[PDB]
Structure formats: C-alpha cells, structure tokens
Amino acid sequence: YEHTATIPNVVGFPYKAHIERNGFSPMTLQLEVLGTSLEPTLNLEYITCEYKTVVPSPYIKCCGTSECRSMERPDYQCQVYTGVYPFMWGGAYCFCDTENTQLSEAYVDRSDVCKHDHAAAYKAHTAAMKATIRISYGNLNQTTTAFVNGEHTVTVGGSRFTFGPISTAWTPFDNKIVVYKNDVYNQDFPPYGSGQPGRFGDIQSRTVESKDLYANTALKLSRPSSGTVHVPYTQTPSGFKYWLKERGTSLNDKAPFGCVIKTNPVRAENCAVGNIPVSMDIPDTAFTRVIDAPAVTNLECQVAVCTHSSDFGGIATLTFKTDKPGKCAVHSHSNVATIQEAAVDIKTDGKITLHFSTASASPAFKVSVCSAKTTCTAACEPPKDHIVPYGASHNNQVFPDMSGTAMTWVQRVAGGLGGLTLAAVAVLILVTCVTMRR
Amino acid sequence: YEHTATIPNVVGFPYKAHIERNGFSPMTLQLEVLGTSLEPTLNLEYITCEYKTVVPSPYIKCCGTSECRSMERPDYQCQVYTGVYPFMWGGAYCFCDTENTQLSEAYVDRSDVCKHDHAAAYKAHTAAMKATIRISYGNLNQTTTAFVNGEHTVTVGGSRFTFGPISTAWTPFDNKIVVYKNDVYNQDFPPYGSGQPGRFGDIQSRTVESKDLYANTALKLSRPSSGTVHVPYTQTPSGFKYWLKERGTSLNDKAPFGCVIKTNPVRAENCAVGNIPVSMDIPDTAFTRVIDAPAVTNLECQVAVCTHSSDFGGIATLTFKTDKPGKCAVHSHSNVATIQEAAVDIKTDGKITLHFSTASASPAFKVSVCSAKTTCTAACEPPKDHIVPYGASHNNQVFPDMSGTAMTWVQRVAGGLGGLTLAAVAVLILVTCVTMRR
Amino acid sequence: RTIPVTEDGIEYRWGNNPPVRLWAQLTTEGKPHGWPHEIILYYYGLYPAATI
Ligand SMILES: CCCCCCCC/C=C\CCCCCCCC(=O)OC[C@H](COP(=O)(O)OCC[N+](C)(C)C)OC(=O)CCCCCCC/C=C/CCCCCCCC
Ligand SMILES: CCCCCCCC/C=C\CCCCCCCC(=O)O[C@H](COC(=O)CCCCCCC/C=C/CCCCCCCC)COP(=O)(O)OCC[N+](C)(C)C
Ligand SMILES: *[C@@H]1O[C@H](CO)[C@@H](O[C@@H]2O[C@H](CO)[C@@H](O[C@@H]3O[C@H](CO)[C@@H](O)[C@H](O)[C@@H]3O)[C@H](O)[C@H]2NC(C)=O)[C@H](O)[C@H]1NC(C)=O
Ligand SMILES: *[C@@H]1O[C@H](CO)[C@@H](O[C@@H]2O[C@H](CO)[C@@H](O)[C@H](O)[C@H]2NC(C)=O)[C@H](O)[C@H]1NC(C)=O
Ligand SMILES: *[C@@H]1O[C@H](CO)[C@@H](O[C@@H]2O[C@H](CO)[C@@H](O)[C@H](O)[C@H]2NC(C)=O)[C@H](O)[C@H]1NC(C)=O
Ligand SMILES: CC(C)CCC[C@@H](C)[C@H]1CC[C@H]2[C@@H]3CC=C4C[C@@H](O)CC[C@]4(C)[C@H]3CC[C@]12C
Ligand SMILES: CCCCCCCCCCCCCCCCCC(=O)O
Ligand SMILES: CCCCCCCCCCCCCCCCCC(=O)O
Ligand SMILES: CCCCCCCCCCCCCCCC(=O)O
Ligand SMILES: CCCCCCCCCCCCCCCC(=O)O
Ligand SMILES: CCCCCCCCCCCCCCCC(=O)O
Ligand SMILES: CCCCCCCCCCCCCCCC(=O)O
Ligand SMILES: *[C@@H]1O[C@H](CO)[C@@H](O)[C@H](O)[C@H]1NC(C)=O
Ligand SMILES: *[C@@H]1O[C@H](CO)[C@@H](O)[C@H](O)[C@H]1NC(C)=O
Numbered sequence: 021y022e023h024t025a026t027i028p029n030v031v032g033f034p035y036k037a038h039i040e041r042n043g044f045s046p047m048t049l050q051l052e053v054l055g056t057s058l059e060p061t062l063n064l065e066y067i068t069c070e071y072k073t074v075v076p077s078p079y080i081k082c083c084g085t086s087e088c089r090s091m092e093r094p095d096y097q098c099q100v101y102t103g104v105y106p107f108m109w110g111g112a113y114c115f116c117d118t119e120n121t122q123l124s125e126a127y128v129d130r131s132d133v134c135k136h137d138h139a140a141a142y143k144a145h146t147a148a149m150k151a152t153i154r155i156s157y158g159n160l161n162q163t164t165t166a167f168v169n170g171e172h173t174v175t176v177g178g179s180r181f182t183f184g185p186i187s188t189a190w191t192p193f194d195n196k197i198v199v200y201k202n203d204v205y206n207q208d209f210p211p212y213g214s215g216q217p218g219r220f221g222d223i224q225s226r227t228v229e230s231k232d233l234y235a236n237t238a239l240k241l242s243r244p245s246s247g248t249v250h251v252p253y254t255q256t257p258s259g260f261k262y263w264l265k266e267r268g269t270s271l272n273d274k275a276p277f278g279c280v281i282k283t284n285p286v287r288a289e290n291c292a293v294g295n296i297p298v299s300m301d302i303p304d305t306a307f308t309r310v311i312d313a314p315a316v317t318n319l320e321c322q323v324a325v326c327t328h329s330s331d332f333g334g335i336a337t338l339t340f341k342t343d344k345p346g347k348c349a350v351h352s353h354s355n356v357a358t359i360q361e362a363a364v365d366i367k368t369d370g371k372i373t374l375h376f377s378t379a380s381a382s383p384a385f386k387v388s389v390c391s392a393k394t395t396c397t398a399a400c401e402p403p404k405d406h407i408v409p410y411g412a413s414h415n416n417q418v419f420p421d422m423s424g425t426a427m428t429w430v431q432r433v434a435g436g437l438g439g440l441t442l443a444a445v446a447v448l449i450l451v452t453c454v455t456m457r458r
Numbered sequence: 459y460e461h462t463a464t465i466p467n468v469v470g471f472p473y474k475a476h477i478e479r480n481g482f483s484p485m486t487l488q489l490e491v492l493g494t495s496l497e498p499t500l501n502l503e504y505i506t507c508e509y510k511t512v513v514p515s516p517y518i519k520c521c522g523t524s525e526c527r528s529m530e531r532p533d534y535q536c537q538v539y540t541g542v543y544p545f546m547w548g549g550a551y552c553f554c555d556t557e558n559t560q561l562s563e564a565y566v567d568r569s570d571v572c573k574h575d576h577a578a579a580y581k582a583h584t585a586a587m588k589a590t591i592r593i594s595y596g597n598l599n600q601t602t603t604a605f606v607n608g609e610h611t612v613t614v615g616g617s618r619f620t621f622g623p624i625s626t627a628w629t630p631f632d633n634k635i636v637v638y639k640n641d642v643y644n645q646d647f648p649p650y651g652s653g654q655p656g657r658f659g660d661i662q663s664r665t666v667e668s669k670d671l672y673a674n675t676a677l678k679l680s681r682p683s684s685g686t687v688h689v690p691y692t693q694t695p696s697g698f699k700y701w702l703k704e705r706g707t708s709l710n711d712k713a714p715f716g717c718v719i720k721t722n723p724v725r726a727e728n729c730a731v732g733n734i735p736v737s738m739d740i741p742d743t744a745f746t747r748v749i750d751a752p753a754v755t756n757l758e759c760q761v762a763v764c765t766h767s768s769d770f771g772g773i774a775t776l777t778f779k780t781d782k783p784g785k786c787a788v789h790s791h792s793n794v795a796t797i798q799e800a801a802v803d804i805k806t807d808g809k810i811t812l813h814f815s816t817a818s819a820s821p822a823f824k825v826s827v828c829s830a831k832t833t834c835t836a837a838c839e840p841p842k843d844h845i846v847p848y849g850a851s852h853n854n855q856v857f858p859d860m861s862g863t864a865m866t867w868v869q870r871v872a873g874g875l876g877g878l879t880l881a882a883v884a885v886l887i888l889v890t891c892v893t894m895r896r
Numbered sequence: 897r898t899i900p901v902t903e904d905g906i907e908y909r910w911g912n913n914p915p916v917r918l919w920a921q922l923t924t925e926g927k928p929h930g931w932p933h934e935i936i937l938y939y940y941g942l943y944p945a946a947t948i
Contacts, residue, residue, distance in 0.1 A: 171649035211609035
C-alpha cells in the first residue's frame with residue numbers, strides 16, 4: 021500500500037501515522053525515533069602536537085677550527101663560536117687561550133608521543149544522517165536503522181520503509197574542525213605550511229606516518245658564556261600546550277538543538293531539528309477487514325478533566341454502540357491534541373477512556389474510533405509545575421477553538437459591531453436611493 | 459616581494475610571469491604545469507558482484523513427512539513436495555509409491571570471488587585539485603607539487619609560493635560513480651535495498667567484510683519430475699555479468715577537456731579548464747641591481763618573417779645599444795604574441811633574435827629588454843599544415859592590429875564616410891543658422 | 897572514417913596503440929595582407945559565421 025507521512029526529528033516523540041485503507045478497517049501506526057546520528061565527512065589536513073628540541077653535545081675543537089655543515093632538518097640551526105675557553109670540574113678543557121671553536125647544533129623533531137598525544141585538523145562537509153526507528157503496528161513490534169535519505173529501504177515485517185531526505189542541511193560543525201581525544205572544536209586552524217610559533221599549528225605533520233615535518237618555532241642560538249659548556253638557545257614554547265590550556269570548552273557545550281558531540285568517528289547525535297519524510301509500503305496481511313472489524317456508531321465525546329501540560333493531562337470519555345468486541349484504531353485528525361494510545365479494547369459497555377496531550381486552553385481535536393466520527397471539545401487548565409524534566413508530548417498549539425470562551429466573546433463583539441455597521445450601511449443606502457429618487 | 463599572477467590550467471605550457479621590481483633589474487619567470495590531478499571524495503555505498511546459488515542435496519523422506527524450516531538466509535526458499543517416487547540407477551530409492559516427501563532448499567550467497575571480482579558504487583563530491591609545477595627563474599630550476607587552493611604554501615629556493623583555488627568547480631564525475639578495476643562509469647546505480655533481478659545491483663553488500671547481504675534474484679522452486687532427484691529451480695541470471703557485457707565505454711572515453719580517468723585512487727588528471735591564480739614571495743637575493751645590469755637604449759623592432767602557426771613561427775630582430783654584456787629579461791606585455799625565450803645573451807653587437815608565437819595576421823605585441831621599450835609590428839602568414847600533433851603555444855588572439863592592412867582599409871572607409879557626414883552636418887548647421895538669422 | 901579536428905583538438909585511439917593527440921592550425925585559402933576581398937576570404941576561411 022502506497023502512503024507517505026512526515027515525522028518530527030525528535031527522539032522520544034510517539035508520532036502516530038494513520039492509514040485509511042479503503043476496503044479494510046483503519047490502522048494506526050507507531051513511528052518512534054530512538055536515536056539519530058549526523059555524520060560529517062572528515063578530510064585530514066595535518067597533525068599537531070608538542071615538539072622536541074634535540075640539542076646534542078657540542079663539539080669543542082681544541083686549538084683548531086671547523087665549519088657549519090648544512091642538514092635537511094626542520095628549523096635547523098648551526099653556529100661555530102670562536103675564542104671559547106670552557107672549563108670542567110678538573111680544570112680547563114681546551115689547551116689554548118682564545119684559539120678554539122665550539123659547534124652549536126639544534127633542531128626540532130616530532131615528539132615521541134605525537135603517536136599518542138596529538139590533535140587533528142579536519143574539514144567537515146556532506147554530513148550523512150542515520151537514524152534508529154521503531155515500527156510497532158498491529159501485532160508486530162520491530163526496530164531498524166536506516167540512512168535518512170530517499171535512497172535507502174529497510175524491510176520491517178514484510179514492509180518496505182524509506183526514511184526520506186532530511187528537511188534541513190543544517191550542521192553544527194563548521195568548515196574547519198579540530199579534534200583532541202573526545203572533544204571537537206570549531207577552530208580556524210592555520211593553513212598548512214603557514215604556522216606561527218607559540219600558537220596552534222606551530223609544528224605541522226600531514227600524517228602520523230609522515231616523514232616530512234614542518235616546524236616554525238623561531239629557534240635562536242647564542243654565544244656560550246666564558247668557561248661553560250651549555251649550548252645556550254632561546255626558543256618559543258610549544259603552541260600545542262598553549263592551545264591545550266587555552267582551548268576552553270568544546271562543541272559539546274555550545275552545540276545548538278541539544279546536539280551531543282562524540283568522536284570515533286566524529287558525529288552529532290540526537291539533534292532536534294527538521295522533519296523526516298516517511299514512505300510506507302504495507303502489504304494486505306497487516307490490515308483487517310471491516311466484516312471482522314466491529315461497527316461503531318453513535319459516538320459522542322464528552323470531557324471530564326483536561327490540563328494542557330507537557331504530558332497527557334487531558335482525559336477523554338467516549339460513548340458508542342458496537343456489535344462485537346475487538347480492537348479499533350484511534351487517531352486525532354487535528355494537531356491541537358495527540359492521543360497517547362493508538363488502539364484501545366472495544367467491548368459491549370460502549371464506554372472507553374482516552375489520554376491526550378494538548379497545549380491550548382480550548383482544544384478542538386477530532387477522534388475517529390474504527391470508522392466512526394465525533395468532535396471532542398474541552399476546556400483545558402493551566403498546569404501546576406513551572407518546570408518539568410520531560411519534553412512536551414503535544415504539537416504546541418495555543419490557538420483556542422473557534423467556539424472557545426475567548427473566541428466566543430471576540431465573535432460576540434465582532435457580531436455586534438458588524439450589525440451596527442450594516443445597519444448604518446443600510447440606512448445610508450436607503451437615504452442615497454431616496455435622494456436619487458427625488 | 460609581493461606579486462600575484464594568473465596562469466592557464468594547461469599542461470606542457472610555460473607561463474612567463476614578469477616582475478617589475480622597482481630598485482632592481484626586471485626578472486621574467488617560468489611557470490610550467492607538469493601535471494594536475496582532480497581528486498574526488500568517494501563514499502562507498504555497496505559492493506556488487508556475481509552471486510552463487512547454493513542448492514544442497516535434497517532430503518528424501520522415504521515413507522514419512524517433514525515440515526519446512528525458516529532460515530535467516532538471503533533469498534531463502536524452502537518448498538516441500540508430497541507423493542514423490544524417485545529412481546536411482548539400481549532402482550527405486552523410496553519404499554511406498556506415493557507416501558513420500560522431498561525437501562527442496564535453495565538460497566543466494568556472496569560468490570567466492572566477490573573478494574576478487576566486484577564493482578563498487580560510490581558518491582563523488584568535493585573534488586580536491588593537486589598540480590605539479592616547475593619554477594625556473596634566474597639561476598635556479600626546481601619542481602614542486604602543491605594542492606591548488608589559497609591555503610597551501612611550498613618553499614622553492616627560499617620563495618613562498620601559494621597557488622590559489624581552481625577558477626571553476628567543474629568536475630567530470632557525477633554524483634553516482636561505479637568503479638570496476640581501472641574503469642569509472644557515470645551510472646545511476648539503484649539505491650541500496652531496492653535492487654531488481656537481472657540488473658546491476660541485484661545483490662548488494664555494504665562492505666567486502668560485510669556479513670549482511672541483500673539479494674533479490676526472484677528465485678523459484680518447482681516440483682521435481684517423476685522418478686528423478688534434481689531439485690528443479692528457475693532463477694534470474696546475474697545482473698553483474700549483464701552489466702559487464704552491457705557496460706560499454708567508461709568515463710575515460712567521454713570525459714570533457716581531455717581528462718584522463720585513472721583509479722587507485724579514482725582521479726581525473728590533466729584536465730584543461732580554468733585558471734590557477736599564483737601568489738609569489740620572492741626575496742631580494744634573486745633579483746639583480748641595475749648598476750650591475752646593462753643599460754639598454756635605442757631599441758627598435760623590425761620583423762623579417764612571421765607565421766601564425768601553433769608553434770613559435772614568428773621571428774623578431776631587435777637592435778639596441780648597451781654598455782656592458784650580460785642577461786636581460788624579455789617579456790611581451792600583450793597577449794597577441796608570446797616570446798619563446800625569457801632571457802637572452804646581451805652583448806656588444808647590439809642585435810638579438812627572438813622567437814614568438816602569434817595567432818593574428820597583423821600582431822602588435824610590445825617587447826621590453828631589461829628596462830628598454832619598443833613596439834614590434836609584423837604581418838604574419840597563414841601556415842602550412844592543416845593538422846599538427848602539438849597544441850597552440852599562443853593565446854589565440856585573431857584581432858588584427860589597429861594599424862593592420864584590413865583595419866587600415868576599414869579606417870580609411872570610415873574616415874571618408876565621417877568626413878562626408880561632417881561636411882553635410884556643417885552645411886545643414888550653417889543653413890539653419892542663416893535661416894534663424896533671417 | 898572522417899574525423900573533424902578543431903582548435904581544441906582531438907585524441908584518437910585505435911586498437912591497443914597508445915592514444916594520439918592532434919590539433920588543427922589556422923589554415924585557409926585567403927590572402928592576409930592583399931586586397932580587401934582577399935582579406936574577407938582570409939577571415940572567412942577561419943571563423944565563418946562571425947565574419948559573415
Ligand atoms: C480586546 C479584544 C482583543 C482581541 C484580539 C484579537 C482576537 C481575534 C484573534 C483571532 C481571530 C481568529 C482568526 C484567525 C487569525 C489569527 C490566528 C491566530 O490567532 O493564530 C494563528 C496562528 C496559529 O497559532 P500557532 O499556535 O499555530 O502558532 C504559534 C507558534 N508557537 C505557539 C509554537 C510559538 O498564530 C500565529 O502563528 C501567530 C504568531 C504570532 C502573531 C503575532 C501578531 C499578533 C496578531 C495576531 C492576530 C490577531 C488579530 C488582531 C486583530 C483582530 C481583530 C479582532
Ligand atoms: C564601419 C563598420 C562598423 C560596423 C561594425 C558592426 C559590428 C558587428 C556586430 C556583430 C558581429 C557579431 C560577431 C561578434 C563580434 C566579435 C568581435 C570581438 O569579439 O572582438 C574581440 C574583442 O574586441 C575588442 O576587445 C574590441 C575591439 C573591437 C571593437 C570595435 C572596433 C572598431 C570597429 C570595428 C571593426 C570591425 C568591423 C568592421 C569591419 C568590416 C568592414 C568591411 C576580438 O578579440 P579576440 O581574438 O579575443 O576575439 C576572438 C574571439 N576568441 C579569441 C575568444 C575566440
Ligand atoms: C698541542 O699543543 C700545541 C701548543 O703549542 C698546539 O700548538 C698550537 O697549534 C695551533 C693550532 O691552531 C697553532 O696556532 C697557530 O698560531 C699561528 C701563529 O699565531 C696562527 O696562524 C694561528 O693561531 C695558528 O692556528 C699553533 O701551532 C700553536 N699555538 C700555540 C703555540 O699556542 C698544537 O696544535 C697542539 N696539537 C695537538 C693536536 O694537541
Ligand atoms: C515494543 O517493545 C519494546 C521493547 O520491549 C517496548 O519497549 C519497552 O517497553 C516496556 C514497557 O512495556 C519497558 O521495558 C520499557 O518501557 C521499554 N524498553 C525500551 C525502551 O527498550 C516498547 O514499549 C514496545 N513498543 C510498543 C509496543 O509501542
Ligand atoms: C630546467 O630543468 C628541467 C628538468 O631537467 C628541464 O627539462 C628538460 O628539458 C630537456 C631539454 O633541454 C629535456 O631533454 C629533458 O627531458 C627535460 N627534463 C624533464 C622534462 O624531466 C627544463 O628545460 C629546464 N628549464 C629551464 C632551463 O628553465
Ligand atoms: C580589408 C577589409 C575591407 C576586410 C574586412 C575586415 C573584416 C571583414 C574582418 C576584419 C577583422 C575580423 C574579425 C576579427 C576577429 C573576430 C573574432 C572571431 O572569434 C570571429 C571572427 C571575427 C569577428 C572577425 C570577423 C571579420 C572581421 C571583422
Ligand atoms: C436587518 C433588518 C432589515 C430591516 C431594515 C429596516 C429599515 C429601517 C426602518 C426605517 C428606515 C428609514 C431611514 C431612511 C430615512 C428616512 C428619511 C428620508 O429618506 O429622507
Ligand atoms: C572642414 C572645413 C571647414 C570649412 C567649411 C567651408 C564652408 C563651405 C563653403 C560654402 C558654404 C555655404 C553653404 C550654405 C548655403 C548657402 C546658401 C544659403 O545659406 O541660403
Ligand atoms: C446591532 C443592533 C441592531 C441593528 C439595528 C440598529 C438600529 C439603529 C437605529 C437606526 C438609525 C435611525 C434611523 C434614521 C437614521 C437617519 O437616516 O438619519
Ligand atoms: C466597496 C465600495 C463600493 C464599490 C463596489 C461597487 C459595486 C456596487 C455598486 C454600487 C451601487 C450602485 C447602484 C446605484 C445606486 C447609487 O447610485 O447609489
Ligand atoms: C570627404 C571629402 C571632403 C569633404 C568635403 C566634401 C565637399 C562636398 C560638397 C559640398 C556640398 C555642396 C554645397 C552646397 C550644398 C547645399 O547647400 O545644397
Ligand atoms: C544629437 C542631436 C542634438 C542633441 C544635442 C543638442 C546640444 C547642442 C545644441 C543644439 C544647437 C542649438 C544652438 C542654436 C542653433 C539652432 O537653433 O539651430
Ligand atoms: C542519543 O543517540 C543514541 C544513538 O544515536 C541513542 O541510542 C540514544 O538513545 C539517544 N539518547 C536519547 C536522547 O534518547
Ligand atoms: C598527466 O598527469 C600526470 C600527473 O598528473 C603527469 O605526470 C603527466 O606528465 C601528464 N601528462 C601530460 C599530458 O603531460
């Protein structure tokens with residue numbers, strides 16, 4: 021059977037889709053969102069971590085001279101210092117007074133635990149949404165997972181279900197994404213090969229298995245002091261540790277729509293935004309015939325108590341007359357209220373109770389039991405709690421009924437004013453007619 | 459030094475970027491595209507291959523009866539047949555003539571060489587371009603590779619080079635991509651879980667290591683014939699082999715702009731479309747001072763022979779007077795012609811030859827030798843070969859010079875007509891002035 | 897077989913032979929710097945419709 025429905029993208033909302041099949045008894049279906057996942061595509065740019073300044077022991081050329089040797093090392097520095105007279109504990113290291121050179125060599129290398137402790141810069145685009153849906157209709161009760169697009173169909177008890185394209189392309193991740201362990205940051209990391217010392221990206225490596233390493237740490241070399249072997253050098257501190265103690269909070273603490281950001285792989289789950297179109301393919305076996313379905317007539321709706329709270333604070337009493345017991349499908353054709361249950365026990369007493377959630381003072385929702393029809397009218401009340409720990413189960417409709425007390429007074433005032441205006445119009449029209457008659 | 463240039467996205471063409479540095483002698487640079495690669499991002503949808511129909515030996519219940527058992531097997535079929543009287547070579551297998559059942563069981567499984575022989579369905583988006591560029595200026599001659607975007611800088615002999623993003627977002631791949639070995643096809647493969655028997659995607663598997671397999675091959679079971687044990691079944695042939703012998707040609711045979719499609723990874727190389735912006739950071743060391751650069755004066759340009767062919771069919775003779783020998787930078791400030799050489803030997807004889815490529819009958823390009831200035835005018839000729847095996851080395855400019863013979867005749871006709879029109883205007887103006895005078 | 901070759905050129909492959917790329921030059925029967933009508937012919941042999 022061909023049928024399409026649209027559901028909210030809310031986790032824990034008991035959406036109900038009603039099928040009015042022609043030759044069969046109506047069926048009401050429970051579409052439940054158990055959990056979603058918005059999965060972006062990540063393009064790794066480089067790997068940033070703490071660096072390691074390797075300063076080997078200086079060669080001290082006692083009464084001699086060497087020259088600097090060029091080396092293919094990131095941030096390599098080399099300096100031959102003349103006139104040095106170092107000292108050791110036992111005495112003077114070199115033989116002459118000022119005829120001596122010391123070779124100072126230093127460079128930047130990937131730290132031993134970039135393999136362990138590192139941050140990855142990513143680009144996020146084309147987020148792919150996948151959601152978990154429970155289908156429970158008639159006698160079956162199943163849960164399946166499908167990609168949310170008009171190109172995936174999953175079998176549920178012989179049924180072909182396709183969760184159509186998500187309504188919005190909104191994503192919480194920006195173009196540039198930096199991931200450290202379980203935290204994701206929306207950060208404009210510097211482009212590869214253009215890093216500054218002391219900031220994030222001072223040293224950059226394309227891959228963990230990369231052999232090429234870019235380092236810009238402003239390494240400097242200076243004369244040793246007289247009678248000391250220490251290879252003086254002044255260098256900018258690691259920008260990775262600076263970022264670590266200036267990162268602040270991650271995207272989990274600022275994501276809109278209550279998104280929960282996790283990593284491995286980077287994803288945003290249970291975001292409450294947009295709608296999920298649903299296309300349904302139900303076979304004949306699921307439906308029930310009206311010859312075996314009870315015939316329900318004389319359905320009136322009266323309401324004892326109703327409160328427009330977040331939960332199902334409305335209580336509806338229905339009276340009807342059936343011929344045989346069985347199970348009807350109940351639905352609200354109006355978004356002013358949502359009936360908690362979908363099928364109730366139908367027996368000879370011809371008197372059932374329904375729980376519904378509304379948000380308006382005077383809701384007018386319509387209830388159909390099997391094929392019967394009736395109108396439910398109520399005066400719902402402002403509820404008791406300022407705060408509750410659960411979300412609203414209604415559609416958040418606050419427009420009162422056309423026949424509500426407020427709309428009744430408004431309509432009375434409008435009717436009186438319109439009667440006065442039409443009386444004035446008729447009087448002037450008659451007067452003008454008489455004037456042209458004379 | 460800050461300088462930006464724009465180059466064509468053509469392989470085998472050397473762009474000549476000229477730097478007019480203020481305090482130094484002009485320098486002309488070689489921008490050579492050795493090879494590009496447009497690299498799309500692939501999202502694997504499913505894996506399609508030939509299937510394997512596994513038909514085990516049928517259980518023949520001699521004078522007895524069994525029931526079919528449901529199995530969690532893709533495309534599973536299980537039909538029981540009563541009244542069977544099979545025969546073997548030695549005689550009748552069962553005992554009773556009609557009191558017997560045979561259990562027919564068949565199913566579809568991933569073939570043993572889907573691990574080897576399979577086709578992958580992909581989605582292509584966000585193609586990333588990377589190009590190989592040779593830089594040879596002054597005394598250096600180097601080749602480097604960089605991603606074509608305004609976020610990558612590569613060091614070339616102390617210089618900071620950044621190739622800004624591809625002028626156009628055009629890609630040869632469509633949304634849906636099917637890859638088989640070294641061929642790529644722009645095919646609308648069926649969505650996952652919605653395959654038809656006998657076509658591509660009749661059986662689908664998410665991954666090569668997937669345990670779940672979707673199969674829709676319309677498998678059918680039918681009564682065995684009397685006195686035979688053969689498990690009859692009729693099934694749709696594999697859609698994979700149908701696609702293999704109906705695939706046709708791949709994207710390599712229809713890609714625009716002469717793109718060459720390869721796999722591992724899927725890419726489009728050497729596509730001739732768009733422009734590649736270039737940002738240049740040249741230090742002082744590369745440039746040469748005008749005090750050590752020769753001073754060139756009295757530069758006239760006369761042209762012996764020129765043919766507007768694809769190659770450098772134009773020959774230019776320049777006369778000048780210098781004080782010392784050395785090396786000037788030569789450039790064409792007009793796209794009409796492109797000088798083959800960027801620096802020529804400058805000596806005392808004061809005459810130099812140049813090779814240039816043009817496409818117009820009467821080109822007017824301007825040549826600067828060191829800091830000198832002159833105008834080159836020529837009458838180029840229609841060339842000899844209807845077809846050549848090499849691309850054009852010019853900018854394809856066919857507008858003749860403002861002073862060319864055709865433009866000379868046009869301008870003469872326009873001047874005569876304008877003189878006649880202005881004479882008529884003056885005569886009428888004088889006549890009207892006299893009329894208002896009287 | 898007849899193959900049209902234009903300014904952008906073609907690349908034809910036949911059998912297992914490596915591909916061959918060919919480009920078309922700016923050829924025509926017109927005279928470039930002669931009388932006006934020869935120049936008409938020259939700019940008509942290449943880019944017909946535009947010069948028409
Ligand atoms: C002393 C006498 C006072 C009488 C005052 C007016 C009384 C008459 C009012 C209505 C007459 C009935 C005709 C229907 C026209 C208005 C319909 C209406 O009222 O609701 C229409 C919609 C439905 O509501 P919803 O819950 O689906 O959307 C709320 C979204 N949520 C709750 C999720 C945040 O509401 C919306 O979208 C509205 C969203 C915000 C609109 C702000 C503009 C304020 C004007 C409203 C219209 C009132 C008319 C004023 C003059 C009339 C002359 C008598
Ligand atoms: C007295 C006669 C006055 C009547 C003139 C009427 C004009 C005709 C109108 C429509 C013609 C449609 C065809 C498109 C025009 C293409 C031109 C173009 O596009 O020019 C382009 C740019 O030009 C300019 O920058 C402007 C300079 C010229 C404009 C005004 C010049 C003054 C007078 C015109 C002389 C020509 C006409 C008179 C000769 C006839 C006498 C017997 C040529 O450069 P290019 O090689 O990139 O072009 C090749 C195209 N490529 C390489 C992209 C394939
Ligand atoms: C053993 O110790 C002797 C001490 O005499 C070293 O002789 C010194 O060797 C240095 C080598 O650089 C020489 O200095 C030289 O002096 C000349 C003249 O001023 C000047 O051109 C340079 O300063 C030149 O290097 C010189 O032979 C000598 N210097 C002194 C006398 O203090 C000898 O090299 C040592 N050999 C070893 C291997 O231990
Ligand atoms: C279908 O079955 C699921 C799983 O058993 C039901 O979910 C549970 O319902 C019972 C109460 O009846 C409790 O264990 C929990 O409330 C639910 N556990 C969960 C959330 O896994 C679910 O109620 C059924 N769905 C229908 C029939 O609507
Ligand atoms: C700079 O070097 C490149 C690479 O060596 C030169 O390219 C070579 O050109 C010669 C002709 O002189 C060819 O025979 C070689 O096959 C080319 N080598 C290649 C393509 O790998 C290039 O000509 C030089 N450019 C200058 C001198 O500016
Ligand atoms: C000697 C005189 C009278 C000959 C007449 C000159 C005319 C016919 C020639 C001179 C320059 C020519 C143009 C030069 C450039 C172009 C651009 C090209 O993409 C199409 C043809 C077109 C538009 C040519 C059309 C014909 C043209 C206008
Ligand atoms: C809705 C009810 C419709 C009935 C309308 C009743 C008409 C009112 C009765 C008197 C109307 C007379 C007003 C016209 C003024 C008479 C003086 C004049 O025309 O010069
Ligand atoms: C470019 C050269 C400028 C010189 C212009 C010369 C003027 C032409 C000489 C005669 C002009 C007389 C035409 C006006 C008609 C006279 C009869 C009348 O006005 O009733
Ligand atoms: C809405 C209340 C009922 C509607 C009728 C109201 C009667 C109003 C009185 C009529 C106006 C007096 C008639 C003479 C007016 C005139 O022509 O000057
Ligand atoms: C909304 C203001 C009036 C516009 C609508 C005009 C259509 C109704 C026709 C007007 C009445 C004409 C009948 C003749 C009587 C008269 O002259 O007053
Ligand atoms: C372009 C050639 C030179 C331009 C001058 C052309 C001279 C044309 C002759 C002038 C027109 C005759 C004067 C009397 C016209 C009148 O008023 O009727
Ligand atoms: C392009 C057509 C004419 C429009 C430009 C008008 C500006 C020039 C002024 C016209 C001439 C007025 C001088 C008085 C002489 C006369 O009456 O003819
Ligand atoms: C959030 O997401 C996971 C999987 O997407 C789901 O299993 C979990 O129940 C969800 N949490 C909520 C809000 O119920
Ligand atoms: C095509 O591409 C490769 C790499 O992108 C390059 O090495 C090769 O030279 C190119 N072929 C041409 C057209 O020169």
